[PDB]
Amino acid sequence: DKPCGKDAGGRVCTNNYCCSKWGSCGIGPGYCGAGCQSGGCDG
């Protein structure tokens, strides 16, 4: 499995997902909240 965000250069999944603080792509409270490095986040 591969990184996103700071541990990749910024990019995320092709879907409107969010990048968690350690490079895991997906959706959830710590993915799209104040944890978000990049992607379709709410904050």
- CA distance linking residue 42 with residue 3, whole number of Å: 20
Cβ atoms < 10 Å from Cβ of 22: 12
First and final CA of the chain: distance in angstroms? 25
Which domains, and CATH codes, for the chain? 1-43 (3.30.60.10)
Is residue 16 within 8 A of residue 39, CB to CB? The reply is yes
Question: Which residues lie below 8 Å from residue 34, measured CB to CB, with a gap of 6+?
Answer: 43
- Which amino acid is located at 4 in the chain? C
SS3 18: strand
Q: Please give the method by which this entry was determined.
A: NMR
Residue bearing tokens 């104040």: 34
Separation CA 33–CA 12 (nearest Å): 15
Q: Are strands 18-19 and 25-26 parallel, antiparallel or unpaired?
A: antiparallel
Backbone φ and ψ for 42, nearest 5 degrees, come out as -105, -45
Distance from C-alpha of 29 to C-alpha of 15, rounded to nearest angstrom:
17
